[PDB]
């Protein structure tokens, strides 16, 4: 199977309330293991997984220094971006940052990425070639100019092809029992009449990993998109996730509708009928 590691960085300015609020979280696929908070009393990188507490002091304090370098970076990025859009200092703004690498079944380098976003909208992102960039607006073109003239994209590809992938292999070994697991979703459907001639058919999928899953409804072969009530994949809090879809059907023709669950943990795509 394929695995991934991602780091997420969020900085929100506080006009007239001091420093900006910085938060950083690291992930291995859909499993969190590190995290930092600017308002926490610890003021250092904290573990958020049992298999990551095995690290020594060099690893712990070494990442606290790098998350502080990322925090002060966004602190300066807010003032620079504020001038790119001619904004005042009385408004709060958000800069978002994420990068990481992917590995396949053989745990070889799949794809590396690094993207920025200012106030929700995309700003700049490293392409798949890991050497050229993609500027969203003209304000991002200014950032592209400074980073291509300094040739700073090659050191990024050096980190995405080495330190990221090589240390991603380590976590998959130290947390082998928790990371290289694939739990099949527990599927079922519920029936509840909402009106005299209407009923709600909710297709369920519980306790699955990873979180990516596809639950779809079909009526005798044709798929439903406008009537299907889909909610985002929610986590149960124990590592596994949940998801349900629903369609309101006239009472009496429920035998025509069928739910289809697609998940990698399933040996074959299963179908629930009536």
């Amino acid at each position: 199977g394929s695995h991934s590691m991602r780091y997420f960085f969020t900085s929100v300015s506080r006009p007239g309330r001091g420093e900006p609020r910085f938060i950083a979280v690291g992930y291995v696929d859909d499993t969190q293991f590190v995290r930092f908070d600017s308002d926490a009393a610890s003021q250092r990188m904290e573990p958020r997984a049992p298999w990551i507490e095995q690290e020594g002091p060099e690893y712990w304090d070494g990442e606290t220094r790098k998350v502080k370098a990322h925090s002060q970076t966004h602190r300066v990025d807010l003032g620079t971006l504020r001038g790119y859009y001619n904004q005042s200092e009385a408004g709060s703004h958000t800069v978002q940052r994420m990068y990481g690498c992917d590995v396949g079944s053989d745990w070889r380098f799949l794809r590396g990425y690094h993207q920025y976003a200012y106030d929700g909208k995309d700003y700049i992102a490293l392409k798949e070639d890991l050497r050229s960039w993609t500027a969203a607006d003209m304000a991002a073109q200014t950032t592209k100019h400074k980073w291509e003239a300094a040739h700073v994209a090659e050191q990024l590809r050096a980190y995405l092809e080495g330190t990221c992938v090589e240390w991603l292999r380590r976590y998959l070994e130290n947390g082998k029992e928790t990371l290289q697991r694939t739990d099949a979703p527990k599927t079922h459907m519920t029936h509840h009449a909402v009106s005299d001639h209407e009923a709600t058919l909710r297709c369920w999928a519980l306790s699955f990993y990873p979180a990516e899953i596809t639950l779809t409804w079909q009526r005798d072969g044709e798929d439903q998109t406008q009537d299907t009530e889909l909610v985002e994949t929610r986590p149960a809090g124990d590592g596994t996730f949940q998801k349900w879809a629903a369609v309101v059907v006239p009472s009496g023709q429920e035998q025509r509708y069928t739910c289809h669950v697609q998940h990698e943990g399933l040996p074959k795509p299963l179908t629930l009928r009536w």
């Binding site: 990068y99 950032t143 980073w147 700073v152």
Partner: peptide, 10 residues
């Protein structure tokens, strides 16, 4: 691990 270097400034 995280990145030790940087991309520069915006």
């Amino acid at each position: 691990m995280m990145w030790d270097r940087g991309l520069g400034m915006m």
